[PDB]
Amino acid sequence: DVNTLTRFVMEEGRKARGTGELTQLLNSLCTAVKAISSAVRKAGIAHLYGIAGVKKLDVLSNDLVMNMLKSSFATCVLVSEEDKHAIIVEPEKRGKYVVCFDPLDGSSNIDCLVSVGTIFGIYRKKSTDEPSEKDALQPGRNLVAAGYALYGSATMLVLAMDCGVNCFMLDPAIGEFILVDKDVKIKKKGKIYSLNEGYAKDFDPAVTEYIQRKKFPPDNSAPYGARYVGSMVADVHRTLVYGGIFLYPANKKSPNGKLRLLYECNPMAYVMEKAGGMATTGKEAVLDVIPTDIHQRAPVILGSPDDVLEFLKVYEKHS
Amino acid sequence: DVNTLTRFVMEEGRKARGTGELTQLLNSLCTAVKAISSAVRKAGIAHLYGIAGKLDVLSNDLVMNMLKSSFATCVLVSEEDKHAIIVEPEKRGKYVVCFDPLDGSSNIDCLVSVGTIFGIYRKKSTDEPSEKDALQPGRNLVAAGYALYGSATMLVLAMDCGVNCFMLDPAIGEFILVDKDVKIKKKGKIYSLNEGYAKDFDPAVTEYIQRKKFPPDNSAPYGARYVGSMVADVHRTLVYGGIFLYPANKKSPNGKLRLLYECNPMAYVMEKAGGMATTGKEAVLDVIPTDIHQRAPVILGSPDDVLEFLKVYEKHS
Amino acid sequence: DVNTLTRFVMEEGRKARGTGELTQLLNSLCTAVKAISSAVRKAGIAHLYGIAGKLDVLSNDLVMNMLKSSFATCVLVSEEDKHAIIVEPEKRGKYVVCFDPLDGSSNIDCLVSVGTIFGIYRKKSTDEPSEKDALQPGRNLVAAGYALYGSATMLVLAMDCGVNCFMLDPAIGEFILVDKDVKIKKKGKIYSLNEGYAKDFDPAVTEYIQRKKFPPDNSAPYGARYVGSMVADVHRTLVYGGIFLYPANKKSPNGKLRLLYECNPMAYVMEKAGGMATTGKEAVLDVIPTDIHQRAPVILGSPDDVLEFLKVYEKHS
Amino acid sequence: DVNTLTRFVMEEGRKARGTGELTQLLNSLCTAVKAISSAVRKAGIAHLYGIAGKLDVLSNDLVMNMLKSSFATCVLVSEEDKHAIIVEPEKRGKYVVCFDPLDGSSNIDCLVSVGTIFGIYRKKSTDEPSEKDALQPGRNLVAAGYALYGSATMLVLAMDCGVNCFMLDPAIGEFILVDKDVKIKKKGKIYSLNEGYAKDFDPAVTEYIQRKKFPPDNSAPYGARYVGSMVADVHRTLVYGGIFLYPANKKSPNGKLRLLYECNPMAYVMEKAGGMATTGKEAVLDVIPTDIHQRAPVILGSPDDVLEFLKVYEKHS
Ligand SMILES: Cn1cc(S(=O)(=O)NC(=O)Nc2ncc(Br)s2)c2cccc(OCC(N)=O)c21
Ligand SMILES: Cn1cc(S(=O)(=O)NC(=O)Nc2ncc(Br)s2)c2cccc(OCC(N)=O)c21
Ligand SMILES: Cn1cc(S(=O)(=O)NC(=O)Nc2ncc(Br)s2)c2cccc(OCC(N)=O)c21
Ligand SMILES: Cn1cc(S(=O)(=O)NC(=O)Nc2ncc(Br)s2)c2cccc(OCC(N)=O)c21
Question: Torsions phi, psi of A157, nearest 5?
């Protein structure tokens, strides 16, 4: 039987006997992701080049997600990669959920048309205070729903909740997300590692050894493959689909990494664990880091459990 | 003034006072490219999953059929066909088309960027057309380029007049000229290759890569990017500069990429854009193939990076 | 502030504190409407014509399957099926849906406007579900409306809260709310009927039209419009005011339009928008059907025009 | 074998051994028509309604700009511009184009079918271009046609080789040839005119319509259809046979439709399809215009129907 994103979210909400506020959130996000897809694919670009003859793509992305979330009446605190301060929804539009999002990750390399994506995480608000930036300061464990949209060769929405990870394919002919992978689970061990090897000069001693273990296996088994798209959503999804390990580790120059905990690492960490993988900073789980700043960074290693554990074995070996 | 792929080709063909045969060939390719793009973005996938109750095979069918019915071709070589296809006599034209209808599709399970690559030759002589008409060196190319089905769909066309970049506007199904007479940066800051095969690397490749991470002159290291889909990596090299490598080693002494419909069109585009493309031993466009599916090693990109690689390669005798 | 069909339906459903079954019906229907629109605008027609070497049946299959799978329905009535369709036990919900999946499809050869018509009833009896559950008068409708595949694709939804119009944005595949709480003009300037049956017109119909061409008060004559596709004509009536007529004639002594899945939904839209809809003897919404494909005469449109027709009808005893 | 509008036109142009100027003009119109199709179907309307917190003017601008930039024209006459547009010398080509960029757009609020009508003349003298280059009779037309934005989007192209109909596949932004060399029925069963203005009908028009509703013989009355959008009624007339009338009366001694860009392009399609088109006094294509916006009466459609009309017309003369 066919299933859509909207109908699927409605069914799950009906099972749990919820109020519909989260479903109205998820549907609003779905509308915003489709408008980003249409724009990322350059619909109407002929008008920019004068077939008769405006905002830039990350500005438009932020406006779409922001405006769809406010007008969902389901949110109260919004954190975006693009805004210094969390946005507190006006009282007339306030709901109970805190959404942290990256409206367009990978945007640095969109001029070469490589894959980009939207990342989001949803927390129920826990305090009884007036809403503030503080409500966004929850660990990833607290996530109610998380996921990402990947605008690749086709457009897919990957949704993670307690019931598992599900993947939805965008059908541009009808503007519908079609359920194509139910309850996905990552391989126990993979054949690909993903990290920017151009910066090997700054690699932590552990990272140097583990990557050395993948290219020059001690037993002389076959080497792993290397892939690095450079757009976080693309690398993590390939890791989910094919297994393997993705690394953005900390080094001496960047003791807490470069990727952002609230709207890059946590949503991705939440997807990985619900699909049976791991996600660590090296010292602890990403979902266990408690942030003190909504834009603070975290190092992240994620993927198949057997690969992330071998990294931890090597990492431990260097203290 | 606004310009499209279709009008652009007509204007050039009218300039050169040609017969219109290549303009039709290109028009058919472009039509095939919009259909591949439509299917790759999974339009109608809702019917596959029962809303009312293969992709490299389809791409091939689209390109084969649009070229056959263009009446401009006589020999077609595809990654997907073991043997060349000879156009029916009543439909024969004067051109040979080599193509990979959808490269990267083996990893389309992760929605990686994929693309269509093509190169066009004039056939060899008024005899019966044959596979030998496709055994020309890349120097002979009349036109080459690629379609990239990435975050957006772009068609890159290289001819004697240079390299031009056309963006597909899906709202109207038209290719819009957005980059006129493209030229690659003289030097870039990114290198692209699967470092997982380091165990098999040639000394020249090992040394050259060591130079990218650990610069002798103290300058900043290059960044690494490797999508694993040749159209996606090569296009990034064109737009951003840098170097792309799939070199020869001892286990694959002639490489992995295919000479006719992967390497030659991309070297042709590169040279036309001011870049270089080498086998290590010689220019890609100078290899004379003896098999339509033969492979070649390829290093292509910004001239100073390809020249810097060649110095190391020369240095290893 | 922006609003979509889905968000509008959910907000209304949450206001009334319902279970979500009707909302799930509406979402499934909306999905089928977008697939029907895609097919009516001929997406993919190139593959029908061999680029790689019936419409009303698909419309019915899309709706049947999207409604079955909503778990919200138990009896389905389609213009395309002789007998009512009983949903299988594991998929049963409490709603009865009568619909024309593609009305006007007979003249789709000329690219005339076509449309989808639907009415939604809560099942009223506690018996095993059967064809009998669809024989309710239009007064009982919970929701009704239509999709017009015209110059653009618009969905018109009528409920207790009134009539709302949603324009399909094909760039993103979402229905956008563009007209809130729509209400028809009190009196209009256009009449709509197939004047080819004039030889068979009842005297009341002939006279009322004579008043439109030759106004007794010297005012301007009404304009005539008759497209021949009921969704197109009624929507023009809704948007511009005026009157639409499909009266009884000799080949159609009980009228021609179907009461269940054409007249009732349109009557419901009209009344909820402040218009009228009559058979001549009584309101369309008060007719009690005895057969799922039975016909009825219908005069509908602006309230002053329908009342002007009714006075003329009364005068003829 | 599949065929597109672009490939078909190139084939016809290569056959005739023309310069390619008309092919560029025709190819520019096609791109303009698809952009009009995108806007009429309301792509991007969600941005207009604030998702991120003109139509006949845009239609005119798309055609004007695409034709100017085609380098194929020198004089442009539009329903939307008081004076002919003279192309700057560096963009001048040999053709004069007359057009209604969006006919029927007055009633587009109701999502009625709308359309684009065009006629193409070779300029006849070597003088500096002026309005006088557009005052040629329709006999002189080199190509004419219309785009219908109906349930789907179709392009109807008429030339000396005949009339051909192309369906836009929106999935790929391509016009697919679906009806080659179409010819109208010798006689039809539909008449089309605004009968609401019967008070103003010429006595001849009154009688002929009376014969259609009340056939003097045994046959069945004709059916009536009137969309009120000229492109839709004429196209239905072409596809189904019959007659379309916007005739002259005493309040409008020269009719209402404009000769250069409404009546002539439609007369040309009709004659090329084997139909007729008359003002009552003479063939539409024979009128010598003296003003670029002058009006003409027009009766067109199936030949036996127009001849029967002319017999009645002669009777009152
Ligand atoms: C997807 N989803 C949504 C909600 S809810 O609270 O908004 N309730 C609703 O929407 N009810 C509805 N009523 C009518 C309609 Br029609 S939908 C919800 C609650 C718990 C868990 C969920 O997902 C399962 C998971 N794996 O976590 C939920
Ligand atoms: C794009 N292009 C196509 C052809 S051709 O031989 O097919 N002739 C035509 O198309 N004639 C035509 N006549 C009317 C129309 Br309307 S098209 C051609 C020849 C030389 C150089 C070209 O491009 C410049 C370059 N290669 O740098 C050419
Ligand atoms: C639009 N609508 C829908 C329903 S319902 O029963 O399906 N309930 C729901 O959907 N609940 C939901 N819970 C969470 C979500 Br999220 S939706 C409904 C019932 C009565 C009247 C309606 O319309 C009001 C009107 N405008 O007349 C209704
Ligand atoms: C469709 N068409 C177009 C032209 S033309 O002058 O522009 N010539 C060309 O385009 N040549 C070309 N050369 C290369 C390419 Br590739 S096209 C033309 C002339 C006469 C008759 C036509 O149609 C048949 C009919 N009238 O019935 C014509």
Answer: -110, 125
Nearest atom of ligand 2 to the alpha carbon of B18:
8
Tokens of A312: 């931890």
Residue C214 tokens, joined: 């030759």
- Please state, in angstroms and rounded to a whole number, the distance separating the CA atoms of residues B16 and B36: 30
Q: Which resolution in angstroms does this entry have?
A: 2.6
Query: What residue's CA is closest to ligand 1, atom 14?
Result: C20
> C17: nearest CA in chain A?
A19
Please tell me the distance in Å from B181's CA to the nearest CA on chain D. 20
Q: Are C176 and C169 in contact (CB under 8 A)?
A: yes
Q: Does ligand 2 lie within 6 Å of residue B288's CB atom?
A: no
Q: What is the DSSP letter of B283?
A: B
Which residue among C14, C23, C95 has the greatest number of ligand 1 atoms within 8 angstroms of its CB, and so is best to mutate?
C23
DSSP-assigned beta bridge partners for residue C274 = none
| Cβ neighbourhood burial of C227 (10 Å; 0-12, 13-18, 19+) | buried
Chain-centre distance of CA C65, in angstroms?
Answer: 20
CB burial class (10 A; 0-12, 13-18, 19+) of residue C211?
A: middle
Quick one: CA dihedral D7, D9, D14, D19, positive or negative? negative
Domains delineated in chain C = 1-181 (3.30.540.10), 182-316 (3.40.190.80)
Best residue for ligand 4 mutational test, from D6, D12, D140 (most atoms within 8 Å of Cβ): D12
What was the structure determination method? X-ray
Chain D interface mutation, best of C110, C151, C185, highest count of D Cβ atoms under 10 Å: C151
Radius of gyration of chain B (CA): 20
Query: Is B57 in a helix, a strand, or coil?
Result: helix
Instruction: Name which of B264, B254, B267, B268 is nearest B297 in CA terms.
Output: B254
Contact D269, D156 (CB under 8 A): yes
Nearest to B196 among A2, A153, A224 (CB): A224
Token readout for B264 is 């030659």
Beta bridge partner(s), residue B147: B116, B155
Residues 6+ apart with CB under 8 A from D267: D138, D277, D283, D284, D285, D298, D300
CB contact under 8 A, A52 and D61: yes
Nearest to D51 by CA among A174, A32, A74, C154: A32
- CB environment C32-44: b (16+ within 10 A), e (fewer): bbbbbbbbbbbbb
Beta carbons of A198 and B176 less than 8 Å apart: no
The two three-digit tokens of residue B26, written as one number: 């290109």
Nearest by CB: A226 against B44, B196, B236 = B196
Sheet holding A94-105, edge to edge: A87-88, A75-80, A94-105, A116-124, A143-151, A155-161, A164-171, A176-181
Burial code of A53-75, b = ≥16 C-beta within 10 A, e = fewer? eeeebbebbbbbbbbbbbbbbbb
Residue A10 Cβ contacting ligand 1 at under 6 Å: yes
Residues A103 and D72: their CA atoms lie apart, in Å, by: 45
User: Of A235, A166, A169, A153, nearest to A197 (Cα)?
Assistant: A235
Residue C15 main-chain phi, psi, to 5 deg: -60, -50
**Tokens representing B23?**
């303009």
Any idea of the CA torsion for C203, C207, C210, C215, to the nearest 10 degrees?
180
**Ligand 3 midpoint to CA A158 (Å):** 28
**Angle, helices A5-15/A21-40, rounded to nearest 10 degrees:** 160
Q: Is A294 helix (H, G, I), strand (E, B) or coil?
A: coil
Q: How many beta-carbon pairs under 8 angstroms link B with D? A: 77
Q: How many helices (H) and strands (E) does chain D have?
A: 8, 13
Chains with at least 3 CB pairs less than 8 angstroms from chain A: B, C, D
